[PDB]
Design a protein around this nucleic acid. Structure first.
Lengths: 68, 73
DNA sequence: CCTTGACAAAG
DNA sequence: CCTTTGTCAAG
């Protein structure tokens, strides 16, 4: 399950969308096609992966941040 | 798939780290060339150079092997 | 591998 | 009005 960790697919969705795979940013449509899924599911997966990254210590790290 | 992440794995860690940071794959937040510069201790222009090389590597490999485009195109 | 200085845009 | 970002050309 994980509340702060990313699954193989979540990270891949991110790498493909942001251009980490071939230097080209890809549309939700293309990524969905790659995953035999809908462009909307990609968008969803994309969003959940980001929250896992934000929250992931980052959000709660803000108090320790004020001290650096 | 590690298979499609071939070129991305041949980038330097620094190069990879720069892309991840700029794009927000580290903490969900997109960072400025300046913030990344501050991270690695160099100017935003330098980071800009590094980022540019990294992408150039990815596009080049992609245009030579045609991994993703043989599928999309 | 790196920094400067001058800009356009956007804020 | 002044500042931040991302670019460029040189070195």
């Amino acid at each position: 399950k994980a509340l702060s960790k990313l699954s193989e697919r979540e990270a891949m969705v991110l790498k493909m969308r942001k251009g980490l795979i071939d230097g080209r940013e890809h549309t939700l449509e293309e990524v969905g096609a790659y995953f035999g899924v809908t462009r909307e599911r990609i968008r969803q997966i994309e969003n959940k992966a980001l929250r896992k990254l934000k929250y992931h210590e980052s959000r709660t790290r803000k108090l320790r941040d004020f001290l650096e």
